Amino acid sequence: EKFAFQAEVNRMMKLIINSLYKNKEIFLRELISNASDALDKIRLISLTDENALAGNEELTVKIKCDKEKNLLHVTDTGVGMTREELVKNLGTAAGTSEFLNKMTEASTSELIGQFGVGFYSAFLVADKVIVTSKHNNDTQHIWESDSNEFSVIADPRGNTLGRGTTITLVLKEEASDYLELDTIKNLVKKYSQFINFPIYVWSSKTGGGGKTVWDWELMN
């Protein structure tokens, strides 16, 4: 059922990702960029095929800090991924050479994005990463990994996303700060530069008369 990452690829990625230890907050920049790409794709598709947005009529990025469960969620209503794409694109050449040539013969913070491995920076702050996704052409599925092995299963909750993807991070004890609204809001704003889609953070808001209310708060 489960899978294991390629021995050499894993080892090399461990070193690549670890080199970003002085600026771990970049994982959020990468997840936001990924969401932006998924949203650009569904937006382009919707220009000629309006029914493409039927499963969820909105184009947004919504972030939720679940202090109660020690989880950080980054959800987009982009194009989503099929079960095969989760297994194939989050599980697997001599292209590694091209990556270390860029490493040694040449910055890591700007190379991961270009090499298409920025997603893995999530492991800088998380012991486990879960990817829940729903694409128009398939049912909702869940990918899970501890950075060494991974598995994919049909989501028993059914199609709850409508369309899109949720990146769920099980935060390391030393990354509890990322559950704080102020910290998350600050980072989102710092990394919501060229994203042409609204990004929200589920937050507490002043409700008046001493009342506290919760709602999505626009960051860009």
Ligand SMILES: COC1=C2C[C@@H](C)C[C@H](OC)[C@H](O)[C@@H](C)/C=C(\C)[C@H](OC(N)=O)[C@@H](OC)/C=C\C=C(/C)C(=O)NC(=CC1=O)C2=O
């Ligand atoms: C150019 O596309 C990108 C690729 C190539 C490829 C895998 C694209 C993918 O093909 C199935 C879909 O077309 C695309 C819409 C899905 C996302 C961007 C997902 O994010 C969300 N929010 O859906 C992301 O989930 C973690 C997919 C894995 C990301 C990896 C391994 C990475 O590190 N960098 C990548 C960032 C990218 O932008 C990357 O490799």
